[PDB]
Symmetry: C2
Subunit: 201 residues, 2 copies
């Protein structure tokens, strides 16, 4: 029988956010009238688990398309890696054109924001871009740091790769999954919070 | 080859909102750094008991395994005004089913005050069947019923409420549903991205 893995981070004031910046925190506003409670959520589009798509995918009631966010993926255990994922750490792996790959790293075993998270280095990004994968997910809130001019994002976007950031892959074994990465259906944005689920084989 | 139907309303400033209230509109903010400020009952969403019950269970208490799994979509587009017990008594509705009702609402783009809602007697019938959930294609599952007996009857039986479905493109029948809401903590509802597959994936 099918296992469903919830690989999404929860959303609440005081949650881990990028570089611990107070302004990146979400805000909940409640209003009560008798027994009726209603609220508003005000959040960064890059909060917690989120999708970042190439600009050209979005701008109608135009939204990030689902063709690639919903389908088979491959999750690789890269918990041995230190500092950053390089081409050398991923070149021998079974990664093909059209694939959606997720990287479980040491990030998954930390609960707070850490500045020196495991990120995808330029050379690994260019390899993945040139391979023409359809997506890549990482388990830190950003897929890149310590690289002026954001070359990892830009190479992946040139090739049309969608990026998922802020996955929580701790309890997920290496293997194949059916992924449903379902972003908030917000018109016009190329970035959106998402609920990402992985299903057995 | 499996079809996925996205049954989620798009979110944008100017969208259909409940009773056309301008304070129910969502708000996007860019600071060139981008935010969305929205009512948790915008568009397609899941209600948490807290919405109608003071100190009621909040959103993270909704079991994700109830939101993922087989469901049944019924065509009730012939109905007028409301769905009564008499409209649904004959349908194959068992214990633990997730049932979705397509109504005249799915064929309307704007908000309508006289939307098709689930009536008190139908809510009571569903609670006694011990269904795991009900979805409707109106922004609210209830109107013109002082004291909100439909939410309450349904909440008391542990029945999950999805509102805001867009179902005009999905044929009557059996689906594997993934209703994937943002992972909000302590809220009365959460916007959900809902997808319907015509076989398990
Ligand atoms: Cl789409
Ligand atoms: Cl294999
Ligand atoms: Cl629509
Ligand atoms: Cl939604
Ligand atoms: Cl949840
Ligand atoms: Cl659960
Ligand atoms: Cl009728
Ligand atoms: Cl059916
Ligand atoms: Zn609602």
């Amino acid at each position: 029988a099918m296992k469903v893995y919830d690989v999404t981070a929860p959303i609440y004031e005081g949650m881990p956010v990028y570089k611990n910046k107070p302004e990146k925190q979400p805000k909940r506003t409640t209003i009560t009238n008798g027994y009726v409670t209603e609220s508003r959520i005000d959040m960064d589009v890059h909060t917690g688990t989120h999708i970042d798509a190439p600009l050209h995918m979005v701008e109608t009631f135009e939204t990030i398309p689902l063709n690639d966010l919903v389908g088979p993926c491959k999750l690789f255990d890269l918990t041995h890696v230190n500092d950053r994922i390089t081409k050398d750490d991923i070149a021998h792996l079974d990664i093909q054109e059209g694939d959606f790959v997720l990287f479980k790293t040491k990030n998954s075993f930390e609960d707070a924001f850490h500045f020196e998270f495991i990120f995808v280095a330029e050379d690994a990004a260019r390899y993945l871009a040139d391979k023409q994968i359809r997506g890549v997910g990482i388990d830190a809130l950003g897929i890149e740091r310590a690289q002026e001019g954001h070359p990892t994002h830009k190479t992946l976007f040139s090739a049309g790769v969608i990026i998922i950031e802020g996955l929580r892959l701790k309890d997920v074994p290496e293997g194949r999954y059916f992924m449903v990465a379902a972003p908030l259906k917000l018109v016009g944005t190329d970035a959106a919070p998402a609920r990402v689920l992985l299903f057995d084989r």
